[PDB]
Design a protein around this ligand. Structure first.
Ligand SMILES: CCCCCCCCCCCCCCCCCC(=O)OC[C@H](COP(=O)([O-])OCC[N+](C)(C)C)OC(=O)CCCCCCCCCCCCCCCCC
Ligand SMILES: CCCCCCCCCCCCCCCCCC(=O)OC[C@H](COP(=O)(O)OCCN)OC(=O)CCCCCCCCCCCCCCCCC
Ligand SMILES: CCCCCCCCCCCCCCCCCC(=O)OC[C@H](COP(=O)(O)OCCN)OC(=O)CCCCCCCCCCCCCCCCC
Ligand SMILES: CCCCCCCCCCCCCCCCCC(=O)OC[C@H](COP(=O)(O)OCCN)OC(=O)CCCCCCCCCCCCCCCCC
Ligand SMILES: CCCCCCCCCCCCCCCCCC(=O)OC[C@H](COP(=O)(O)OCCN)OC(=O)CCCCCCCCCCCCCCCCC
Ligand SMILES: CCCCCCCCCCCCO[C@@H]1O[C@H](CO)[C@@H](O[C@H]2O[C@H](CO)[C@@H](O)[C@H](O)[C@H]2O)[C@H](O)[C@H]1O
Ligand SMILES: N=C(N)NC(=N)NCCc1ccc(I)c(Cl)c1
Ligand code: SF4
Ligand code: SF4
Ligand code: SF4
Lengths: 77, 307, 101, 176, 44, 154, 144
């Protein structure tokens, strides 16, 4: 079965190497989570690529993607 | 006899190109704390042979609906011109002793940019055409400084004969009076041969690809032989010519290795940045040193002989 | 005649390698002009190269010209020509002809 | 507590400005980088001679699954289905019934090795050390079907690898 | 007696972490002097 | 003549397995272990397997990670562009059969639904060594080919 | 020192039993190092160690040239290493099976098999359960 978790919802975050990595975890009182939203820091960073690449050249976009430290495992989940 | 001589130049050129592919991989390997090819033959000695065979028995894809006339003409021109660049090289004697050999090499290499232009047309892809047009702009731009640097050096030599450069350097390498020119010449050959950190194209298949690769690496070795002759002249003893060939070959090998050494060591320029390197740094200095090297023999009374 | 033989051999071997590269056996038995969106900046680079190339053509005879007795005239004209190349570059430079932005 | 990574003012004396001009025109810091790759060229490489040499592993390593026995040769598995229940990938399928001698044993024990995530949760959950992840990691196959393990395949893995599996368990069981 | 992975009595020795990029070479003055000296010897 | 054909088959097989140029579809975590196979300890380049190749110059495709539905058409397009002979190595549970995500609405349950597969490397991820074992297993598979022998019995 | 380096290179030729033995290992294993023989398994694989090498290269195996009727002079596989030596070779332990032998069990395989994929000995999966529903079998006599 697993251990049951008291009902409730938490947003918990840590300073992960790529930024703030958090989970919004909702418990309904049972042994399975009701909802688990994963906050991946690269999600918001990649959303800023268009803003950050403004007034730059094509080869700079490669650098800007690199500077943001983007792993699509977390961006896409 | 002369047909034997031609084949004794062409065939070693191709084998030297094949085994440069092995040396580059192994030199880069040890600089990267690894080994590189060491399984296919002892110490990787059969790797180039395996690669060549693999490439020629691969399916030879074509773009289809292309200017296939120029899909085939691009590598024929590239390899034909690359092999042609070697016929005036004095090692210490040239296959063809040209009075204007230095200018013949300038003329022939200026045509090499066509195989880039034709290959972009033959791809039928508008984005491949753009990449080819970017490579052409990089190549012709660095042709400018290579020509002006060469002319500056020949004002101390006094002729367009490649074997006169040997005479000019009997007492001293030209790198000493002209190290500023040699620095820009060497970097220009890197950008001319699209080598790292100017390998922006890397920023054809099967045998046709192998022929483009062999033409490119023939030019890389060729430009480093020319560099050794131009700036690191070997002393030639007429009665022991192979002493020249050994020493000059070592210098050429070391310069070619330095191309691999540089590839291992640096990031890659942006396109606009290597265009600014030429037009705003090399070319201003090259023009000033051309004026200096035109004046210098006159004001020192060191004008070289014509003959 | 030697140069022709060297040229003919070089491009003949190149042709043979390319045609052989295409005609090796496959062992299969089954069926097988507008305005490019390219910047004006690249046109100006090619034109700039062409005009500098023409200037280099005029400087190529300089090693022979340095053997003249009329060195005062020869040196003046050599520097005149190179300085005009410098002025051409400076005009391109100051007029933003060398920019990519 | 914090530090600045790039808050500095270059000196503008002639000696400092001339130092930077020389670096610009003589490429001194580029030449320095060449020195470092040159030093690596003469270092011994880190490459090992696979497959004659192998990368080191620990007794905890999670590799190919196997079903184990007691010293008598009886199967350890008693079809409790804890492994199936815990499996994060639902990679285990079990059927059971009384054996002809009344023993509680499985009639099916399948592991889809292409569903498995090699997490080791099955061997944690097993109350009798019946299912383990063994030390073998060199079992790639030419077909997908070969990676759908049934009980016969898994028992054969146990008989094939038990010598090593038992020694590894002996080294790590006091940590469990 | 309990036995688990622990640091040695007294702890481990110091570990370096600060950037260490030493200064090398000659000043810009000397480098230009050698370069210009080389040019003049070559010209002569 | 059978002796000549057998030797010619051996020569081309040796060249093709001694010069495997991979195109890596680094889709997810399995790509990292592929990186560690190119890294100094295992140095795949020492076997003649270059680090990275363009699709038009590649002999083997390595599907290293989860293949989602959105990605599947792109992967099939790259496979169709590879010159032949071409081989596919499926690396890791996701590519082999969907793995942890087998029951998801957005995941292809094994890349072998999209392309023919020559070697399946198990693991989540397979160790760099395990992938190298698979590459060397692909080489032995190529060593077994008898293309010219079968051609001359047609 | 270059003479000591060259002397050591020569000592590898003699350490391998002469030129032929030196060349055999050079072409079979692409390695001419000479180690200490730790032991040999019943299949002919030989295990060596040299603790002066860096961790990872301090243990190796020279595979037998034949195993279970398969010519392995050129075709060597990592799965040819039997389980008892597998532990030693991967550094899961310090002691080879010549010093610390594995426990004997009647049911343990006496003969190790390597990867059998692609051959007629390959595993083929199948359901291990018996038929679940029994169908009615009509009488063999006629009577409608
Ligand atoms: C055109 C002529 C070029 C000839 C190339 C010579 C190839 C030699 C060769 O195959 O290497 C020996 C190879 C060495 O065998 P190998 O490739 O299996 O090497 C085994 C050793 N490990 C495990 C480290 C890889 O011999 C063969 O592979 C057998 C086929 C011979 C092919 C040539 C016969 C004609
Ligand atoms: C593509 C390949 C391009 C080929 C271009 C050939 C250019 C040859 C010029 C090279 C050269 O300068 O020497 C060759 C010779 C002139 O001789 P010269 O340089 O003055 O020195 C020796 C004289 N005693 O001049 C000759 O040997 C005469 C060659 C005439 C035939 C050239 C045909 C060109 C047609 C290309 C299409
Ligand atoms: C990444 C950039 C790295 C820098 C660029 C690459 C540098 C490579 C430089 C290659 C040249 C180095 C010198 C190679 C020595 C070759 C062996 C030899 O014989 O040296 C002889 C040389 C003096 O002999 P010699 O050339 O005949 O001098 C008479 C002048 N005509 O004796 C002098 O040594
Ligand atoms: C003792 C002798 C000392 C002489 C000192 C004179 C130095 C003057 C340098 C002028 C300067 O500061 O250059 C700055 C500027 C580059 O700045 P930038 O951001 O690229 O934009 C400039 C647009 N014109 O550059 C410019 O403004 C462009 C200047 C024209 C380009 C110079 C080309 C000179 C020709 C080369 C050969 C020299 C003869
Ligand atoms: C007595 C009177 C005498 C009169 C004459 C006196 C003349 C002597 C004084 C002048 C000396 C000039 C030296 C000429 C070399 C070229 C100088 C140069 O252009 O370097 C600067 C260039 C651009 O500099 P950057 O920092 O990018 O930007 C500055 C613009 N704001 O940056 C670069 O070009 C860097 C190169 C990038 C490529 C890196 C890869 C090469 C690194 C290895 C180099 C090895 C050395 C080459 C040896 C060749 C041997 C043949
Ligand atoms: C360096 C020169 C060395 C000379 C050696 C001469 C050996 C001659 C034997 C050539 C063997 C070629 O072997 C064959 O190559 C072609 C690609 O080129 C492959 O591809 C071919 O067949 C496949 C189907 O089988 C087709 O889908 C493909 O379009 C076709 O090109 C074949 O799958 C392979 O069987
Ligand atoms: N670029 C890579 N993929 N690595 C690499 N340097 N390969 C070079 C392989 C090669 C190419 C053409 C020939 I002719 C030969 Cl003999 C060998
Ligand atoms: S290792 Fe994990 S995923 Fe694989 S069978 Fe065991 S519990 Fe299931
Ligand atoms: S292997 Fe272990 S956990 Fe799984 S059913 Fe058998 S006894 Fe239970
Ligand atoms: S098989 Fe495992 S390691 Fe590989 S991509 Fe899937 S989850 Fe990641």
């Amino acid at each position: 079965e697993g251990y049951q978790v008291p009902p409730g919802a938490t947003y918990t975050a840590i300073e992960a190497p790529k930024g703030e990595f958090g989970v919004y975890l909702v418990s309904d009182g049972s042994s399975r989570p009701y909802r688990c939203k994963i906050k991946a820091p690269g999600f918001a960073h990649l959303a800023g690529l268009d803003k950050m690449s403004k007034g730059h050249m094509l080869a700079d976009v490669v650098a800007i993607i690199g500077t943001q430290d983007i792993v699509f495992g977390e961006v896409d989940r | 006899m002369f047909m034997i001589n031609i084949l004794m130049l062409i065939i070693p050129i191709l084998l030297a190109v094949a085994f440069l592919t092995l040396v580059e991989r192994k030199v880069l390997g040890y600089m990267q704390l690894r080994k590189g090819p060491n399984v296919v033959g002892p110490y990787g000695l059969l790797q180039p042979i395996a690669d060549a065979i693999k490439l020629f028995i691969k399916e030879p894809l074509r773009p289809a609906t292309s200017s296939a006339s120029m899909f085939i003409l691009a590598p024929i021109m590239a390899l034909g011109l690359a092999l042609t660049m070697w016929i005036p090289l004095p090692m210490p004697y040239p296959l063809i002793n040209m009075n204007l050999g230095v200018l013949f090499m300038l003329a022939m290499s200026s045509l090499a940019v066509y195989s880039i232009l034709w290959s972009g047309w033959a791809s039928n892809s508008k984005y491949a055409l753009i990449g080819a047009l970017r490579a052409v702009a990089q190549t012709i731009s660095y042709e400018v400084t290579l020509a002006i640097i060469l002319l500056s050096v020949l004002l101390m030599s006094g002729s367009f004969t490649l074997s006169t450069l040997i005479t000019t350097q009997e007492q001293m390498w030209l790198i000493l009076p002209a190290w500023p020119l040699a620095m820009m010449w060497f970097i220009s050959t890197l950008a001319e041969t699209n080598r790292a950190p100017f390998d922006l194209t890397e920023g054809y298949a099967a045998g046709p690809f192998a022929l483009f690769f062999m033409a490119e690496y023939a030019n890389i070795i060729m430009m480093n032989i020319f560099t050794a002759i131009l700036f690191l002249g070997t002393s030639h003893n007429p009665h022991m010519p192979e002493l020249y060939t050994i020493n000059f070959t070592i210098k050429s090998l070391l310069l070619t290795m330095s191309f691999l050494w540089i590839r291992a060591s640096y990031p890659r320029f942006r396109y606009d940045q290597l265009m600014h390197l030429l037009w705003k740094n090399f070319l201003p200095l090259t023009l000033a040193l051309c004026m200096w090297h035109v004046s210098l023999p006159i004001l020192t009374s060191g004008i070289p002989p014509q003959t | 005649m030697n140069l022709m033989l060297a040229l003919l051999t070089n491009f003949t071997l190149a042709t043979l390698l390319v045609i052989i590269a295409f005609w090796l056996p496959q062992l299969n038995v089954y069926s097988e002009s507008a305005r490019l969106p390219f910047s004006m900046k690249f046109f100006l680079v090619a034109i700039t190269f062409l005009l500098f190339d023409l200037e280099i053509a005029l400087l190529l005879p300089l090693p022979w010209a340095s053997q003249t007795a009329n060195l005062n005239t020869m040196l003046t004209m050599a520097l005149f020509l190179i300085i005009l190349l410098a002025v051409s570059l400076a005009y391109e430079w100051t007029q933003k002809g060398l920019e990519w932005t | 507590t914090y530090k600045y990574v790039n808050l500095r003012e270059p000196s503008m004396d002639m000696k400092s400005v001339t130092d930077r001009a020389a670096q610009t025109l003589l490429w001194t810091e580029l030449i320095r980088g060449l020195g470092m790759t040159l030093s690596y060229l003469f270092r011994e490489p880190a490459t090992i001679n696979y497959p004659f040499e192998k990368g080191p592993l620990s007794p905890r390593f999670r590799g190919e699954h196997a079903l184990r026995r007691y010293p008598s040769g009886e199967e350890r598995c008693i079809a409790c289905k804890l492994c199936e229940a815990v499996c994060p990938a639902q990679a285990i399928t079990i059927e059971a019934e009384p054996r002809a001698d009344g023993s509680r044993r499985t009639t099916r024990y399948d592991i889809d090795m292409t569903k498995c995530i090699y997490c080791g949760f099955c061997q944690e959950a097993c109350p009798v050390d019946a299912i383990v992840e063994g030390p073998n990691f060199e079992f790639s196959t030419e077909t997908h079907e070969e990676l759908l393990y049934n009980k016969e395949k898994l028992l054969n893995n146990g008989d094939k690898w038990e010598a090593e599996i038992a020694a590894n368990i002996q080294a790590d069981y006091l940590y469990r | 007696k309990v036995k688990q992975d622990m640091p040695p009595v007294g702890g481990y020795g110091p570990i370096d972490y600060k950037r260490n990029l030493p200064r090398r070479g000659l000043s810009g003055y000397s480098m230009f002097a050698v370069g210009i000296g080389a040019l003049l010897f070559g010209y002569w | 003549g059978e002796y000549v054909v057998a030797k010619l088959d051996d020569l081309i097989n040796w060249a093709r397995r001694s010069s495997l140029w991979p195109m890596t579809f680094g889709l997810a975590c399995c790509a990292v272990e592929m990186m560690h196979m190119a890294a100094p300890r295992y140095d795949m380049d020492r076997f003649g397997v270059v680090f990275r190749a363009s699709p038009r110059q590649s002999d083997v495709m390595i599907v290293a990670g989860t293949l989602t539905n959105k990605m599947a058409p792109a992967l099939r397009k790259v496979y169709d562009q590879m010159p032949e002979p071409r081989y596919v190595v499926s690396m890791g549970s996701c590519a082999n059969g969907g793995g942890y995500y087998h029951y998801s609405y957005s995941v292809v349950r094994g890349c072998d639904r999209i392309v023919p597969v020559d070697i399946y490397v198990p693991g989540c991820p397979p160790t760099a060594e395990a992938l190298l074992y698979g590459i060397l297993q692909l080489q032995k598979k190529i060593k077994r080919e008898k293309r010219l022998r079968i051609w001359y019995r047609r | 020192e270059l003479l000591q380096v060259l002397k050591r290179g020569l000592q590898q030729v003699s350490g391998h039993g002469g030129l032929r033995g030196y060349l055999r290992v050079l072409f079979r294993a692409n390695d001419v190092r000479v180690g200490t023989l730790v032991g040999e398994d019943k299949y002919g694989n030989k295990y060596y160690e040299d603790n002066k090498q860096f961790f990872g290269r301090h243990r190796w195996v020279i595979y037998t040239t034949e195993m279970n009727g398969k010519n392995t002079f050129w075709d060597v596989d990592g799965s040819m290493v039997p389980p008892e030596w597998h532990r030693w070779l991967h550094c899961m332990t310090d002691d080879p099976p010549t010093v610390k032998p594995p426990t004997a069990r009647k049911f343990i395989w006496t003969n190790h098999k390597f990867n059998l994929s692609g051959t007629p000995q390959q595993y083929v999966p199948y359901s291990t359960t018996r038929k679940k529903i029994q169908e009615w079998v009509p009488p063999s006599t006629p009577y409608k």
